[PDB]
Amino acid sequence: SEVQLVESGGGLVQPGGSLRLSCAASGFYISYSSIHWVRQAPGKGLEWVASISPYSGSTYYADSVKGRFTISADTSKNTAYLQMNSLRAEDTAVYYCARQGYRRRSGRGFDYWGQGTLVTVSSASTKGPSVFPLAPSSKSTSGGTAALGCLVKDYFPEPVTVSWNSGALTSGVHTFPAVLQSSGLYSLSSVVTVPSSSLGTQTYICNVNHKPSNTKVDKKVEPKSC
Amino acid sequence: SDIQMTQSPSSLSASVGDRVTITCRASQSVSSAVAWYQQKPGKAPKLLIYSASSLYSGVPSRFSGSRSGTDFTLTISSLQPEDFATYYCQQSYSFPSTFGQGTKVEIKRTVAAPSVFIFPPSDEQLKSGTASVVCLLNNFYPREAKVQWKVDNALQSGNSQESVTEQDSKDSTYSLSSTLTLSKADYEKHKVYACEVTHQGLSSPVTKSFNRGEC
RNA sequence: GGCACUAUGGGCGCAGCGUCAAUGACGCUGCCGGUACAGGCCAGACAAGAAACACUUGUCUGAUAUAGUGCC
């Protein structure tokens, strides 16, 4: 129960820049097991990166990182490291370090993994969102209900928080995953379905919060009529 | 050459009580150096099977591993509700190590057709010089869905982006959002902007459209 | 790769010197090439050590091997 691994030190870093992840062990002596780094791109799968071997310091790399990354351990500190160099837009991910088990107990299976650190690489500066209403109307009514929403447009970095009527409205909302625009910025929309007859009777406000740029935006969404 | 790990199915929709088998095939012999994982959204992976058939300590017995040469199938005898997640095979036969791309297991329910909504660009955004045209497909199952944008009947490519929700906690349906991006100028050069929605619950592809400058 | 044929500087002939090459091959002599037992040692294979490689320690293959050719 007492094995634990705590990554630390990830962040934003510009393309070509460098960043050193940490991997603190506790509950076991790090020296007698093989320690890995695995990465997982946003929305993608797990991608093995690196490993260093007990008693030998034998290190290994995946092709996509070879010659840039430098896996190491420091047994006086019970910690493993991942030095990352000439980082690329593709290197954006959450990084896990992992303990491969004891040979007789778990083969070469990875029996403990950290909770991951987030590594984001971009040339994009921080930029607060534009919010543009997605106005409800006909073309957005399917009988008793209407769809309406906000576009959170051209912000960096993740995440934003989107609430409706300062949190008072929650059911039937969908806030969508951010999508990365080829400009290096993110952009998402959030939609709410309401009973159509409430369009004249209940006001609706999207509350868009983007702490990195320290901007809070309320957009009243109003119907279009004719 | 690096060993290839390719999984099937890439996603699988099943219900509690189902016998589920995920298959995975290595590009060379990897003996039994194959590990399985369960990963749930936002959390870190959890080991299920090592040595391709050794049930990892503390993992419930409905999980089992199996091998025929380079064929590795992780099978769950009787699906339980906390099993809905992503699964991974891994070879640790040689460095570099290789993971499969992943099999997501989603909840099977009755076919539900999308409700389609479209939203023309704001007066506010158009003032900025950009026009984004948004199509929402609401509360459908299964996930598979064609969104096809037409501007004066011309099929659009490379100017739209899609986003999908995770299967809903309460009706186990999804929602998708395709946004068309245009320059303001590209927008005023045309009149009819349309969303074409093609889906299994629909008898034929449904379309929602508008005319630039409509009340 | 397997088979069949054929040949057989100790699995470790070197003073070695080169070369390719990043380390085994290759080449070049020169001695010695007699015979066998070696010791020792090395390499491959495997196993265990908190152990993918490396290491330690244990057995095992090193004419059941090695090589040229022929053949599918």
Distance CA A187, CA B187 (A): 20
- Is-contact B66 B72, C-beta < 8 A? yes
Question: Coil, strand, or helix at residue B92?
Answer: coil
Distance CA A176, CA A226 (A): 29
Residues 6+ apart with CB under 8 A from B15: B79, B107, B108, B109
Tokens of A153: 């447009």
Distances (CA, A) of A212 to A12, A126, A216: 12, 7, 11
Distance CA B22, CA B9 (A): 6
Domain housing B47: 5-108
Determine how many CB atoms are found less than 10 A away from the CB of residue B195: 26
Å from B18 to nearest chain A CA?
25
Q: Residue B101 CA to C68 C1' — how many Å?
A: 48
Closest alpha carbon to B120 in B199, B187, B37: B187
Q: Residue A24 CA to C31 C1' — how many Å?
A: 64
B170's torsion region: left (phi>0), alpha (psi -120 to 50) or beta? alpha
Residues β-bridged to residue B115: B138
The count of domains in chain A is 2
Residue B167 is given by DSSP the state: P
Tell whether B57 and B125 lie within a shared domain.
no
Tell whether B138 and B87 lie within a shared domain.
no
Distance CA A160, CA A35 (A): 34
Tokens of A97: 């370090």
Closest residue, chain B, to A135 (C-alpha)? B119
Backbone angles phi, psi at B170, to 5 degrees: -120, -40
- Is-contact B52 B98, C-beta < 8 A? no
Backbone angles phi, psi at A78, to 5 degrees: 55, 30
Give the resolution value in Å.
3.1
Residue from B136, B162, B210 to probe the interface with A (highest A Cβ count within 10 Å): B136
Distance CA B109, CA B14 (A): 8
Distance CA B143, CA B207 (A): 18
Of B88, B134, B175, the CB nearest to A151: B134
Å from B144 to nearest chain A CA?
17
A148's torsion region: left (phi>0), alpha (psi -120 to 50) or beta? beta
| Residue environment code for A118-132, b if the CB has 16+ CB neighbours within 10 A, otherwise e | ebbbbebeebbbbbb
Give start and end residues of each alpha helix (H) in chain A.
Answer: 103-106
Tell whether A182 and A81 lie within a shared domain.
no
Closest alpha carbon to A20 in A65, A71, A67: A71
Q: Give the position of tokens 């797990």.
A: A46
Distance CA A83, CA A102 (A): 26
Distance CA B123, CA B104 (A): 40
Residue from B6, B51, B92, B207 to probe the interface with A (highest A Cβ count within 10 Å): B92
Cis peptide before A15 (omega within 30 of 0): no
Of A46, A101, A147, the CB nearest to B45: A46
Distance CA A192, CA A36 (A): 43
Distance CA B207, CA B56 (A): 50
Q: Can you give the CATH number for the domain in which A198 is found?
A: 2.60.40.10
Distance CA A113, CA B46 (A): 8
Q: How large is the greatest C-alpha to C-alpha distance in chain A, in angstroms?
A: 77
Determine how many CB atoms are found less than 10 A away from the CB of residue A214: 9
Q: Can you give the CATH number for the domain in which B58 is found?
A: 2.60.40.10
Query: Which residue, of A95, A121, A147, is where some domain finishes?
Result: A121
Half-sphere exposure of A175 (CA within 13 A, CB side): 15
Tokens of A96: 């896990």
Percent composition of chain B: helix, strand, coil (DSSP 3-state, to 5): 5, 50, 45
Q: Residue A33 CA to C45 C1' — how many Å?
A: 26
Residue B215 counted as domain residue = no
- Is-contact A206 A168, C-beta < 8 A? no
Residues 6+ apart with CB under 8 A from A161: A207, A208, A209, A210, A211
A105's torsion region: left (phi>0), alpha (psi -120 to 50) or beta? alpha
- Is-contact A92 A122, C-beta < 8 A? yes
Question: Coil, strand, or helix at residue B185?
Answer: helix
Distance CA B23, CA B189 (A): 51
Give start and end residues of each alpha helix (H) in A37-158.
Answer: 103-106
Residues 6+ apart with CB under 8 A from B205: B146, B148, B196, B197, B198, B199
Q: Give the position of tokens 């007789």.
A: A104
Domain housing A181: 130-221
Closest residue, chain A, to B95 (C-alpha)? A60
Closest alpha carbon to B156 in B120, B195, B118, B190: B195
Q: Give the position of tokens 């000439």.
A: A86
Q: Is A223 on the interface with B (CB under 8 A)?
A: no
Tokens of A137: 């109307």
A-facing residues of B in 155-214 (CB < 8 A) are 161-165, 175, 177, 179, 181, 208, 210
Distance CA A179, CA A159 (A): 11
Backbone angles phi, psi at A213, to 5 degrees: -95, 0
Question: Coil, strand, or helix at residue A115?
Answer: coil
Tell whether B96 and B158 lie within a shared domain.
no
**For nucleic chain C, which protein residues have CB less than 7 Å from any of its atoms?**
A 28-29, 32-34, 51, 53-56, 58, 100, 102-104, 108; B 33, 92-95, 97
Tell whether A17 and A90 lie within a shared domain.
yes
Helix count and strand count (H, E) for chain B: 2, 19
B129's torsion region: left (phi>0), alpha (psi -120 to 50) or beta? left
Tell whether A23 and A100 lie within a shared domain.
yes
Experimental method: X-ray
Distance CA B180, CA B154 (A): 13
Closest residue, chain A, to B165 (C-alpha)? A176
Distance CA B9, CA B25 (A): 12
Tell whether B126 and B84 lie within a shared domain.
no
Query: Which residue, of B87, B108, B129, is where some domain finishes?
Result: B108
Distances (CA, A) of A51 to A68, A89, A105, B182: 14, 23, 19, 46
- Is-contact A145 A137, C-beta < 8 A? no
Q: Which residues in A lie closer than 8 A to residue B132 (C-beta atoms)?
A: 132, 151, 153
